[PDB]
Design a protein around this ligand. Structure first.
Ligand SMILES: Nc1ncnc2c1ncn2[C@@H]1O[C@H](COP(=O)(O)OP(=O)(O)OP(=O)(O)O)[C@@H](O)[C@H]1O
Ligand SMILES: Nc1ncnc2c1ncn2[C@@H]1O[C@H](COP(=O)(O)OP(=O)(O)OP(=O)(O)O)[C@@H](O)[C@H]1O
Lengths: 295, 285, 225, 295, 227
């Protein structure tokens, strides 16, 4: 029947145990906020993975006269450099990359040259991949000063420290969010017990006069619904202020360092429905069987 | 009774060339100045394109230079350095290198803004020069038409009036006193600006041209845009331009020197200065 | 058409006296049934047996509609609208009003809106407190707070209205008001099952008195004082 | 002193509600240990900044016209400044830097910008070392626009700006610690309104027997103190396993670079008494005044 | 002076009829008084007024030992050692035996364990909990669960044992012996004060029965009966 009676009875619980309800909001905000912060840095690392080079990669470049011509591997100068790096079994493959593919990704490698920086500027690459990325300093020195190669670039041997601290921070946030969620599960069971103990005087009335079983759990479950939605809302609103107060001076210059991409007030909106369908279901699965096994 | 009106209409046809000549002169000076200013703006645009090209080569070299792993910020130096000894050196080098980057970006942006402003100025100058050439062509177009119309009155004055009228039906600013020695006996030449053709207002060199002057010979520009003179103040500056808008402004050589031709050849008589009628007729210079 | 229970049993931790043993008493629709007995009799368990809130270990329970010995949890609240209970502590909500306490079994069922307020003054006219139905029950004296507890269980018509200690703390002067109210309730056609715990009223009614002593049935003749 | 009476009731009190108890254990461990982790990164920040004071180098640049026409300091313009700086109370030694080597020392340090870096873009400079490089306000009010210098770098804030993202992490941890600490105080506050409610049957009698007013809330306090101290005890144990399992590879990867102070188990055990006293204070001050308004 | 209180009143909020007038009541030491008053009006506020659970709005409640209407920060239990208080409900402890419920009210006032075994097992055999006294009160019947609440009150030998609805909900067959137990504390010199709503039990011994109507005393009979 009509929901006009459920709306003006939850205000009694909103005034009866005020010191218990807002503690639930504060701990559920910390739980799903730490979970959201853990998911945001995983999204951050996955968005920032495309800037650098992967596990099996070693960037190399070409001299100006070779890269000015040879738009495809058709001149003998291309095979002359390819064959000498197929002489050694340290590498496995060389990807075909040339001048034309070096500017359609110029937005991707550096989102700062979004203007017309200029064609015929970025050197051709012919980059290599090797299965043993520790003993390649000798390879880089063999590519140092050789007549036909400009220079090399490496993202391993103590350059890929960025992802190792991002993964550690993500797992730390996930662990603290997980144990906070375990504490939240126990507080689910306590608030329904508090609402049962303080407001038992009509539970017996509804048990005697012939209330249906499902309608008895409805006022306690809608309390858990409003508590979970209020907690997730305060957590999302807290993510904005923890970014805006003292992370708009320390995180933003990584983009000017060209290390990580945009995280803004938009990609949190792509995870906020997942925060809702996590937090509200997390409250409501665990606020049901407590009333079944005790009420 | 027909002996006067045939030259009366021809007088405007004679002075039309002199009236249009000054317009033509200011139009050609305007289009020459516009062409010179447009050429200067084209040179400025070429210089702006040259500085844009060299700063473009600089910005492509620095855009390439960061693609080989050139990092100039400082935050990723602790992501790159392997000892605190050279980390300090990396920060010290990148602190001035990022300053070099910022100066190059500011210089490129200023060069782009200056090139855009120079291109807009060159476009406006080219439009102004094209407009000036348009008025030059417009003031040529009526000029070649009325120059052909100038030859119409020759057949009715220098060809039709010469059959009849035989021997029976026919101070110091001048310094010439009697401008009638080589001046009479010349019943015009072509009604124009011939140096010696003696066409109505064509007698200004023998009297007024004595200390330079180089007046434009218009009898309309100084009739309106000039310093006024009073004949009653003992200043001989009044002429016979009264009751005739844009007409001859011949200065009398003394008092009563009407040296001209009525239709084709006339003598000079001592008649009073009766051509001065309405106001705003003629001035000094 | 019989509404009783027989050969029931109930043990929670120890057997000792396992609630009741076997019950053969004839109760009819419109009978004053008393439940005198000592405090060890387990008369509240006998209340819960007809309430289907305590599951019997043996026997069967059937109050005039169906056997509730093995009734599922889906249909157990359906056999609760015809059941009425009054207790010691008056079961009153402090924050609500005197009208709101008796108008509490209306909205929990979900009947027609015009039939909500069409019966509350109709049942306040047969209880005694016809008037002063707007004051707070916290400010009301305890004599009429019991009559709120009877008048609350009149939204649906109860076939049996079983009491569980409705006096004993009340004054004998105001016990007359409580006791004669149930007489007019029984004239509607319903039965009541009294469970008082003293001697003065049970030697005043000469009605069907059922005694119970730790499962054993002490004195049963269904008449007399 | 009647301690054996208090020793056996606390187990029955824990068995009365172990659910709320373990909820308070979890939220106490998280709120206290997260503040402890916020203190540890503050310790790491200045302890890893302190291993740079012996090697940080203050630098002052020179103007162009005293370096554009001469390589070494031979003109009389720099002969004043060459030994004006040794006339100072806080300078070890002064080394002049030639402009020719100060161009290609960057190229030798990293073979990059070998064509775009300006030849007249690296001014000549000197070397100054201070006993107080953090307190470099002496040169801020002395190195003015002297005839022979261009600008004052004012030692460097580069290391100070560099070690600021973890300061942002520290006060993020402090903000989350206070936010969850408010919920911890509230969960202490409603600990006793269900701890007294679950065992009313004897706290409702020693009011009317003659027990002292201090001894009423003493067993309702001692169990909260034990809960707080085992929560702090598992807080440091959980911070051990988030340091040694998630941040561990991140710190051992900075081990070889020697850039971090490397906080060890002795360093987290150094802050254990202050953390424990904070937990005991936060669960003793707020589990006392909530009984003055209840009993 | 002896135990005498007068002019006591406590006007609660939102109550135009607080049912506490300024009545000058007077009792006798060693004498039993029965306060069979009305229902729900004032039968408990006066009953807790001797224990000073509610601070009176007016008057000076007094006992034979010290002043009761004014306290300090350390004198509130000093009133309540000598109070033996019994309610309607049994309120035993469900985690300990009948031999431990009586002794539970002894270490809370600071009594050594050597004096427990010489005093506490010298009490509950008088009330009727004899023989073994090891049965758990969760399984005992309510006839014997009330007398242990009586014996819990008589531990430090109080001079007053005030009781609110002692029979409460019991048959007269198991309430007639309650009079025979309570007279054994009554003849020891204890001013036992019983608030009851059961007639024809206090009409037998004909002791001092008082009654308020709606907030004022109407019956003061030293040997009266209930009407
Ligand atoms: N839920 C229960 N759990 C355990 N034992 C119970 C329960 N209900 C009843 N008993 C047992 O039955 C005995 C009497 O039951 P019950 O509570 O119904 O008695 P009663 O006659 O209504 O009297 P009173 O309310 O005065 O105790 C109890 O003393 C106990 O031994
Ligand atoms: N804690 C309280 N706060 C405010 N008013 C109270 C409180 N307790 C009782 N009252 C008021 O006191 C009156 C109830 O009567 P009183 O407290 O004197 O005891 P009683 O009802 O006669 O006794 P018993 O509690 O044994 O039934 C009502 O007016 C009620 O509002």
């Amino acid at each position: 029947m009509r929901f006009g009676f459920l709306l003006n009875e939850v205000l009694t619980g909103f005034r009866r145990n005020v010191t218990m309800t807002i503690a639930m909001i504060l701990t559920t905000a910390i739980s799903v906020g730490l979970f959201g912060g853990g998911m945001l840095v995983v999204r951050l690392a996955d968005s920032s993975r495309a800037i650098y080079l992967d596990r099996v990669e070693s960037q190399v470049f070409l001299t100006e006269d070779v890269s000015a011509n040879d738009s495809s591997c058709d001149t003998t100068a291309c095979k002359a450099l390819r064959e000498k790096i197929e002489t050694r079994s340290d590498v496995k493959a060389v990807r075909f990359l040339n001048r034309q593919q070096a500017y359609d990704d110029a937005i991707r490698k550096f989102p700062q040259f979004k203007d017309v920086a200029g064609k015929d500027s970025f050197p051709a690459s012919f980059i290599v991949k090797l299965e043993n990325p520790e003993q390649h300093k000798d390879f880089d020195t063999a590519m140092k000063g050789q007549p036909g190669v400009l220079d090399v670039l490496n993202q391993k041997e103590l350059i890929d420290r960025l992802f190792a601290v991002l993964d550690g921070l993500s797992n730390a946030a996930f662990a603290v969010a997980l144990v906070q969620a375990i504490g939240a599960i126990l507080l689910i069971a306590n608030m329904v017990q508090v609402a049962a103990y303080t407001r038992r005087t009509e539970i017996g009335i509804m048990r005697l006069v012939g209330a249906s079983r499902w309608y008895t759990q409805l006022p306690f479950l809608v309390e858990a619904m409003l508590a979970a939605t209020m907690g997730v809302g305060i957590a999302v609103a807290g993510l904005m202020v923890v970014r805006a107060l003292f992370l708009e001076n320390a995180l933003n210059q990584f983009y000017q360092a060209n290390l990580i991409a945009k995280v803004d007030y938009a990609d949190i909106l792509f995870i906020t429905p997942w925060l809702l369908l996590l937090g509200v279901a997390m409250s409501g699965l665990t606020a049901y069987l407590t009333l079944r096994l005790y009420v | 009774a027909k002996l006067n009106e045939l030259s009366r209409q021809a007088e405007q046809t004679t002075e039309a060339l002199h009236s249009a000549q000054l317009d033509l002169n200011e139009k050609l000076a305007a289009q020459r100045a516009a062409d010179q200013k447009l050429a200067d703006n084209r040179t400025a645009l070429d210089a702006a394109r040259a500085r844009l090209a060299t700063f473009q080569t600089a910005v492509n070299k620095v855009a390439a230079a960061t693609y080989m792993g050139g990092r100039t910020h400082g935050m990723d130096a602790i992501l790159t350095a392997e000892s605190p000894q050279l980390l300090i050196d990396r920060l010290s080098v990148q602190r001035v290198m990022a300053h070099q980057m910022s100066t190059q970006m500011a210089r490129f942006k200023a060069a782009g803004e200056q090139a855009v402003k120079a291109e807009q100025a060159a476009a406006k100058s080219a439009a102004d020069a094209r407009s000036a050439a348009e008025q030059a062509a417009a003031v040529r177009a009526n000029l070649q038409h009325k120059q052909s119309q100038l030859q119409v009155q020759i057949a009715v004055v220098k060809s039709q009036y010469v059959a009849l009228t035989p021997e029976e039906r026919t101070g110091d600013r001048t310094a010439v006193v009697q401008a009638a020695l080589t001046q009479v006996g010349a019943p015009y030449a072509w009604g124009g600006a011939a140096p010696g053709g003696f066409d109505c207002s064509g007698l200004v060199m023998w009297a007024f041209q004595q200390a330079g002057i180089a007046l434009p010979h218009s009898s309309q520009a100084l009739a309106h845009g000039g310093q006024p003179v009073a004949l009653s103040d003992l200043q001989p500056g009044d002429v016979l331009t009264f009751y005739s808008d844009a007409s001859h402004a011949g200065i009398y050589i003394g008092d009563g020197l009407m040296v001209h031709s009525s239709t084709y050849g006339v003598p000079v008589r001592v008649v009073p200065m009766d051509s001065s009628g309405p106001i705003y007729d003629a001035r000094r210079y | 058409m019989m509404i009783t229970l027989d050969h029931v049993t109930k043990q929670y931790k120890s057997s000792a006296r396992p609630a009741l043993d076997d019950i053969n008493v004839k109760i009819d629709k419109g009978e004053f049934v008393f439940l005198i007995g000592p405090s060890g009799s387990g008369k509240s368990t006998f209340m819960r047996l007809l309430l289907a809130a305590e599951t019997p270990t043996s026997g069967d329970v059937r109050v005039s509609k169906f056997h509730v010995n093995k009734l599922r949890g889906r249909h157990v609240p359906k056999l609760r609208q015809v059941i009425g209970c009054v207790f010691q502590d008056f079961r009153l909500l402090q924050q609500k009003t005197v009208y709101d306490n008796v108008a509490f079994a209306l909205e929990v069922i979900g009947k027609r809106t015009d039939a909500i307020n069409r019966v509350v003054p109709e049942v306040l006219e047969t209880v005694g407190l016809s008037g002063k139905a707007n004051r707070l029950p916290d400010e009301l004296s305890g004599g009429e707070q019991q009559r709120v507890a009877i008048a609350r269980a009149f939204v649906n018509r109860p076939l049996v209205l079983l009491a569980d200690q409705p006096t004993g703390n009340l004054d004998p002067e105001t016990s007359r008001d409580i006791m004669d109210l149930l007489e007019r309730i029984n004239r509607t056609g319903t039965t009541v099952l009294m469970a008082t715990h003293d001697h003065h009223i049970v030697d005043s009614m000469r009605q069907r008195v059922v005694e119970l002593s730790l499962g054993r049935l002490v004195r049963d003749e269904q008449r007399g004082v």
